[PDB]
Design a binder for this molecule. Structure first.
Ligand SMILES: CN(C)c1ccc2c(-c3ccccc3C(=O)O)c3ccc(=[N+](C)C)cc-3oc2c1
Length: 153
């Protein structure tokens, strides 16, 4: 995990997001539809996202899990309906940059977990991906996602 993996201490950033329970079969259309309804709201308000979208994965129950996914925005933006105000995760974290298709992102979860065991830290359970590249616009072998495992201190 040399060079590639690093520890970080993260601050909450304000976001608009949707919190829901889903599986991996349904994630794709869910994110497409939800992210689009988020940008439609921000467009309607003249507000721009302050950064790339993300998803917080947690609540694992067999194939299912909860997820909060959205866009980070500036302070003072309000939601509507299913789009609620929220915050990015915070705390100590192990961060690595994954490049490749989402159906092979386990590659970096394995590595980020061995580097956690082999350095005497522990997981808080929840993961946090940041989608630096739009997958619609980006070759799958160039798709940049930052993978962030929240640690427990
Ligand atoms: C780096 N920026 C600017 C962006 C912008 C948009 C997306 C959309 C999206 C948003 C709305 C409509 C289509 C797409 C898409 O492109 O399919 C993503 C969609 C899904 C996604 N996963 C993790 C499944 C990840 C997505 O990441 C994005 C990143």
């Amino acid at each position: 995990c040399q060079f590639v993996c690093e520890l970080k201490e993260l601050a909450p950033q304000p976001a608009l997001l949707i919190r829901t329970r889903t599986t991996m079969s349904e994630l794709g259309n869910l994110f497409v539809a939800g992210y689009t309804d988020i940008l439609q709201l921000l467009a309607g308000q003249g507000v721009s996202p302050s950064g790339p979208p993300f998803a917080r994965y947690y609540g694992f129950d067999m194939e299912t899990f909860d997820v909060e996914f959205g866009f980070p925005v500036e302070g003072g933006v309000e939601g509507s309906g299913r789009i609620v105000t929220g915050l990015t995760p915070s705390g100590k974290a192990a961060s690595s940059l994954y490049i490749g298709p989402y159906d092979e992102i386990e590659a970096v979860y394995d590595a980020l977990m061995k580097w956690v065991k082999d350095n005497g830290y522990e997981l808080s359970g929840e993961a946090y991906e940041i989608y630096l590249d739009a997958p619609a616009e980006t070759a799958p072998d160039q798709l940049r996602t930052r993978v962030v495992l929240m640690l427990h201190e």
